[PDB]
């Protein structure tokens, strides 16, 4: 089977605040699903994706490996009031289906998040110690 | 009062675990720190596949943790500037069976996933903070330089014991052992000609 299931990850600021879930699903057919949603609220920008275990930890202004994206939901919601005068809040649903291809197992997750007062990348790998 | 000592890049504390081992379900590190420099180790723990790693790196903070199968890093940033500005920031890192924790001044995240495993949080192998040996580079440390600047409050601490490592070497331990020479203060880091 796997290492893991029930991802979660919670990232914090006053400005924006990020909740993540992802999960598993093995087809028995040589392929498995990673299903990710997560939600924001606030301003600034959140990502959240599959890596290899390669993947460089950096900042980066932008947007071998058998796990690719098959769909992508994004609904986005914007408030529009100026604070002093401008101002705005955001809220953000996403919902994300990557299929991987069994052979190779070793998944990362990478999250990347950028708000006004802070930013902050994360690579976790759940099961790298099976790796090496 | 606080428990304070400046790092000038050739001095680190060393704290000996391996007449001592370390284990438990759960874990936490605190310090504060303050620097002027991009680049430098600020404590590492755990020669074992378990460890933490906590760093700057080009005035981030970096986080790597191997936490038994998997492991976590991360880079945490101000906005609009650094952490290397001269001014006190505040770290704070928990690790249990299923969560890590990191928290660096306004920022928090708290990520975590189903394990289904038996896993021991601990290490052997000497507790570094400031730096660490030359020839001696450790398990998931990101930075090979010693840390330049002020740490405050280091604490490790989990289920069994409580370690106040900047206690210990400012006041003393046969465990505790300080190499090359440091001022258990927070010197003017403009100045540390």
């Given at each position: ?24 699903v ?22 959240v994706?599959?890596?290899?275990p ?51 197992k ?10 006004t ?16 | ?65 191997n ?21 006190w ?74 370690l ?22 927070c ?7």
């Amino acid at each position: 089977d796997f290492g893991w299931g029930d991802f979660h990850s919670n990232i914090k600021t006053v400005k924006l605040n990020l909740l993540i879930t992802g999960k598993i699903v093995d087809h028995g057919d040589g392929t498995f699903s990673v299903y990710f949603r997560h939600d924001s609220t606030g301003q600034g920008d959140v990502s959240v994706s599959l890596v290899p275990p390669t993947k460089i930890v950096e900042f980066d202004l932008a947007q071998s490996f058998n796990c690719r994206i098959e769909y992508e939901k994004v609904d986005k919601a914007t408030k529009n009031t100026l604070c002093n005068y401008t101002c705005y809040q955001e809220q953000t649903q996403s919902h994300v289906s990557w299929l991987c291809s069994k052979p190779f197992k070793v998944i990362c997750i990478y999250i990347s998040f950028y708000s006004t007062d802070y930013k902050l990348v994360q690579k976790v790998c759940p099961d790298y110690n099976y790796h090496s | 009062d606080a428990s304070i000592a400046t790092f000038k890049g050739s001095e680190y504390f060393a704290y000996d675990l391996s007449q001592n081992p370390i284990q438990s379900s759960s874990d936490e590190i605190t310090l504060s720190f303050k620097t002027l420099q991009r680049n430098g180790l600020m404590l590492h723990t755990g020669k074992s596949a378990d460890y933490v790693n906590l760093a700057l790196k080009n005035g981030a903070v970096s986080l790597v943790i191997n936490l038994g199968s998997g492991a976590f890093e991360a880079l945490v940033e101000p906005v609009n500037g650094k952490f290397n500005d001269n001014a006190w920031h505040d770290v704070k890192v928990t690790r249990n069976l299923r969560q890590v924790t990191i928290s660096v001044d306004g920022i928090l995240t708290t990520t975590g996933y189903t394990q289904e495993d038996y896993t021991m949080l601990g290490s052997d192998d000497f507790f570094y903070v400031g730096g660490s040996p030359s020839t001696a580079d450790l398990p998931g440390s990101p930075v090979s330089n010693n840390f330049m600047g002020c740490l405050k409050e280091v604490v490790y601490k989990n289920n069994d014991v409580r370690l106040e490592l900047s206690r210990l070497a400012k006041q003393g331990d046969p465990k505790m052992k300080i190499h090359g020479v440091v001022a258990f203060k927070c010197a003017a880091l403009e100045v540390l000609f």
